[PDB]
Amino acid sequence: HFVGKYEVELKFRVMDLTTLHEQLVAQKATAFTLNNHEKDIYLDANGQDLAKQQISMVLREMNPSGIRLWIVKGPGAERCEASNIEDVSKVQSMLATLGYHPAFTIEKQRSIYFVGKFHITVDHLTGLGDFAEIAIMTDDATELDKLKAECRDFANTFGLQVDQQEPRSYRQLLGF
Amino acid sequence: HFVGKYEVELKFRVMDLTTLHEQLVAQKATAFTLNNHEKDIYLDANGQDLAKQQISMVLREMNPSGIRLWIVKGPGAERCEASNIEDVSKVQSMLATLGYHPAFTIEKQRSIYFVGKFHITVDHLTGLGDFAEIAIMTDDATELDKLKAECRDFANTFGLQVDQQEPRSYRQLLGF
Numbered sequence: 001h002f003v004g005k006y007e008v009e010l011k012f013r014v015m016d017l018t019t020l021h022e023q024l025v026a027q028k029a030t031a032f033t034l035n036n037h038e039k040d041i042y043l044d045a046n047g048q049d050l051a052k053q054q055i056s057m058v059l060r061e062m063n064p065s066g067i068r069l070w071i072v073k074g075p076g077a078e079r080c081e082a083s084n085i086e087d088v089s090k091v092q093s094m095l096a097t098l099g100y101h102p103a104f105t106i107e108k109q110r111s112i113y114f115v116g117k118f119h120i121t122v123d124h125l126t127g128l129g130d131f132a133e134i135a136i137m138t139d140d141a142t143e144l145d146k147l148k149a150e151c152r153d154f155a156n157t158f159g160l161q162v163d164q165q166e167p168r169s170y171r172q173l174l175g176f
Numbered sequence: 177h178f179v180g181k182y183e184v185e186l187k188f189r190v191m192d193l194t195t196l197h198e199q200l201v202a203q204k205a206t207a208f209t210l211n212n213h214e215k216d217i218y219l220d221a222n223g224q225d226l227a228k229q230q231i232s233m234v235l236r237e238m239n240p241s242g243i244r245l246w247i248v249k250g251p252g253a254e255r256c257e258a259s260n261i262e263d264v265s266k267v268q269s270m271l272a273t274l275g276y277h278p279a280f281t282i283e284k285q286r287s288i289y290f291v292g293k294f295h296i297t298v299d300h301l302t303g304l305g306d307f308a309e310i311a312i313m314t315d316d317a318t319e320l321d322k323l324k325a326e327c328r329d330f331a332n333t334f335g336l337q338v339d340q341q342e343p344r345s346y347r348q349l350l351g352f
């Protein structure tokens with residue numbers, strides 16, 4: 001479910017969580033991980049070198065699931081790779097040696113469900129409210145066309161509507 | 177054994193592999209890895225930004241132990257940190273996004289033994305020959321001189337003498 005260098009996705013504001021849960025049930029979604037607090041530390045160079053290239057780099061800690069991820073997103077909104085790491089402070093030290101330092105933090109509550117090849121991620125952020133994203137990862141850039149159309153078809157059958165679309169990232173929404 | 181951000185290390189050309197091995201037995205060394213093939217991919221920015229800071233960055237694969245490491249050495253002498261990684265190609269792709277690309281590769285056969293607080297590495301490099309590294313990692317900068325002198329004593333005890341000390345790195349010896 002998380003294999004590749006590209007994450008094809010469509011994100012929406014969710015206005016009613018009960019209806020979302022019903023939409024999930026209707027699609028026979030299965031739970032991957034539920035109700036994790038994710039703390040994302042974003043790193044960048046002193047002169048915001050990565051952000052100036054549309055790149056974000058995150059050390060993510062997920063609790064209680066215990067997962068820790070090193071994530072590089074971009075350039076732009078499709079490219080996304082992650083590596084499991086065992087020791088966040090060790091990787092953060094190593095990145096600091098290379099000149100990347102904590103820039104800001106984004107926290108959220110996240111649940112991830114699966115329906116066939118798709119993953120559905122349901123997020124809550126304090127100022128901002130609830131979001132749901134339909135996504136699929138691929139290693140093959142030639143496919144991004146097919147897959148984005150497929151995401152749209154699934155979003156449509158699921159019940160997630162264009163009026164509620166939210167194209168911006170959390171760092172864009174929060175002003176980072 | 178591999179805890180810290182400093183590594184104190186002395187490397188020697190090995191003139192007498194038999195004595196070295198005989199002493200590993202005498203001193204009841206424990207084998208951590210034996211006769212592994214190690215392939216080290218060195219990475220740097222196009223402008224050699226890391227070398228200009230006396231930083232080296234390596235992705236190492238050791239077989240058959242299946243250990244994979246991301247290693248950042250430097251800046252300058254005695255600084256070294258490493259992280260276990262699941263997948264070299266994944267980390268390599270992530271670092272390429274940040275601007276670090278393969279510069280050259282070094283291969284060697286390496287065995288790693290522990291004796292008390294020390295580790296001793298016995299290396300063979302096709303063009304170059306046989307070497308041994310005597311090393312210890314620490315987080316404490318206040319003991320580095322003592323540790324280095326202890327490494328030299330310990331090395332003499334395996335038949336490794338000051339006149340066979342080799343200050344150049346493998347990258348230097350191989351013209352990289």
Ligand SMILES: Nc1ncnc2c1ncn2[C@@H]1O[C@@H]2COP(=O)(O)O[C@H]2[C@H]1O
Nearest residue numbers: 002007067069071073080081082112137
């Ligand atoms: N264990 C995991 N849990 C959640 N996402 C993961 C995991 N492993 C890899 N990923 C992927 O890494 C990506 C990092 O950015 P996203 O949160 O947008 O989406 C994430 C997933 O596609």
Ligand SMILES: Nc1ncnc2c1ncn2[C@@H]1O[C@@H]2COP(=O)(O)O[C@H]2[C@H]1O
Nearest residue numbers: 178183243245247256257258259311313
């Ligand atoms: N699991 C491990 N196996 C081997 N070396 C390790 C491990 N974890 C950390 N290291 C250190 O990473 C260093 C990388 O550079 P060296 O080969 O000189 O010495 C290595 C060890 O001191």
Ligand SMILES: [Mn+2]
Nearest residue numbers: 007009133135
């Ligand atoms: Mn996503």
Ligand SMILES: [Mn+2]
Nearest residue numbers: 007119121135
């Ligand atoms: Mn995802």
Ligand SMILES: [Mn+2]
Nearest residue numbers: 183185295311
């Ligand atoms: Mn070592």
